Copies of this chain bind each other. A is one copy, B any other.
Amino acid sequence: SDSAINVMKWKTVSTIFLVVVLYLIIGATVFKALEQPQEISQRTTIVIQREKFLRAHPCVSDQELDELIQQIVAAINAGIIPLGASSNQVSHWDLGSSFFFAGTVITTIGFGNISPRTEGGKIFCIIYALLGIPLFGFLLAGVGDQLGTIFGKGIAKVEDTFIKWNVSQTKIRIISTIIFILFGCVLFVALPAVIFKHIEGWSALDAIYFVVITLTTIGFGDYVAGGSDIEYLDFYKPVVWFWILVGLAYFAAVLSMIGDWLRVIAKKTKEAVGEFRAHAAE
């Protein structure tokens, strides 16, 4: 009965797929409901800024105007400060920023603000990730273990003081998982999001949004710690490397937990549908 279970497996893969299709649909509508308006109010006002110099300088080709912008945007992807008051310019591929870049590869964050333009940079980048991603896999795992055992020692002390009359074995894990979410979200989310707000100038929401986008390895790149030129004590960046190293370890378990809650809510809903069928109006 080898196919007995494979027939059953495909039945579970297909329902998870139809539920993933439905999760993309619900989200797809909620984002354009949130973002479609601001996009329009920003295209009407940007055309208002277009005309105020479209006919403010008729002695330009006015086709090269929309062609000029192409030369800027197309050239901004690499990072360009085309200004006359700032002809001197800081590098994006210097000693520290190309060390950053390597980090954003092996950790699959890939912010993208700085990416290779040379065919060699690309070819090396493909080799670098195909090796470096697995390699960094072991480090993050060891950093998960260590960080994990440092918590086993802490709960061995918290699960002995709260041992009062009428204690249970399986219920006390509920108390455990709560302290993991609470203390975790402080050191890896709350505390570092504050330093971001003050060092990068970001808002409270923007710093948290950066933390989540970064430590889930989505890494859009719209916000990046250490991106601007401000001052960067350089006590700053090396601490961020460590935050990433341990902050990734954290979300790895957190995300993995959230999934278990999803099998369970999946079990209790699969059986609640059996109950409902089973009674269904008397």
Contact = CB atoms under 8 A, between A and B. Distances in A.
Interface stretch (A160-168, A172-180, A208-216, A270-278): A208-216
Contacts of A50: 82, 84
Copies of this chain present: 2
A12 to B, nearest CB: 6
A235 interface: no
Contact of A80 (B43, B92, B143): B43
A1 to B, nearest CB: 15
Given A102-B24, A119-B205, A142 B110 contact: no
Contacts of A6: 149
B220 A112 contact: yes
B220 A217 contact: no
Contact of A122 (B112, B129, B205): B205
A35 B222 contact: no
A112 B24 contact: no
B133 A216 contact: yes
Interface residues of A, number: 125
Nearest to A42: B78
A222 B112 contact: yes
B53 A57 contact: no
A227 interface: no
Interface in A167-210: 205-206, 208-209
A158 interface: no
Given A46-B80, A102-B27, A124 B259 contact: no
A126 B208 contact: yes
A121 B47 CA distance: 24
A135 interface: yes
A93 B128 contact: no
A39 interface: yes
A20 B124 contact: no
Given A30-B124, A57-B60, A13 B143 contact: yes
A76 B73 contact: yes
Interface string A112-135: 100111111111111011111111
A103 to B, nearest CB: 6
A252 B121 CA distance: 24
Interface in A24-60: 24-25, 27-32, 34-40, 42-43, 46-47, 49-50, 53, 57-60
Contact of A102 (B31, B53, B102, B121): B31
Contacts of A138: 16, 259, 262
A217 B53 CA distance: 41
A159 interface: no
